Amino acid sequence: SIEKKEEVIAHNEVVFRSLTQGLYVKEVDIYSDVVSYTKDVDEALAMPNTINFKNSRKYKKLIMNLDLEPLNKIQKVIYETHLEGL
């Protein structure tokens, strides 16, 4: 008995994964080649992906690397109001 429902987006950012190694990028060099890795989603080279930050330039070389798999990490909070009768 969902009386009302609402959704909120807290974060929306891109995170990259190596196809074979299964790790997530955390650091890059001056040439923008990967230097480090982590197996933790909470610590990754996050690229903002909100409305204002689309069409970036910082990570063009990183994107074109075929070994990397971009992922849209999105965090949400949803409020649900229940009326359960008496």
**Contacting positions for a copy of itself (CB under 8 A):** 3-4, 15, 21, 23, 26-27, 34-43, 69-86
Q: Closest approach of Cβ 78 to another protein, in Å?
A: 20
**Is 15 a residue that touches another protein (CB under 8 A)?**
no
Q: What are the angstrom distances between the C-alpha of 20 and each of 4, 10, 52, 55?
A: 44, 30, 32, 27
Q: Closest approach of Cβ 58 to a copy of itself, in Å?
A: 18
**Is 54 a residue that touches another protein (CB under 8 A)?**
yes
Please say which residue, 1 or 52, places its beta carbon nearer to a copy of itself.
1
> What spatial distance separates the first Cα and last Cα of the chain, rounded to whole Å?
13
Environment class of residue 26 by beta-carbon count within 10 Å: exposed (0-12), middle (13-18) or buried (19+)? middle
**Residue 49, token pair as written in the block:** 């992906």
**Is 47 a residue that touches another protein (CB under 8 A)?**
yes
* Calpha distance 72→13 (Å, rounded): 6
Q: Which residues bind another protein (CB under 8 A)?
A: 14, 47, 49, 52-57, 70, 72, 84, 86
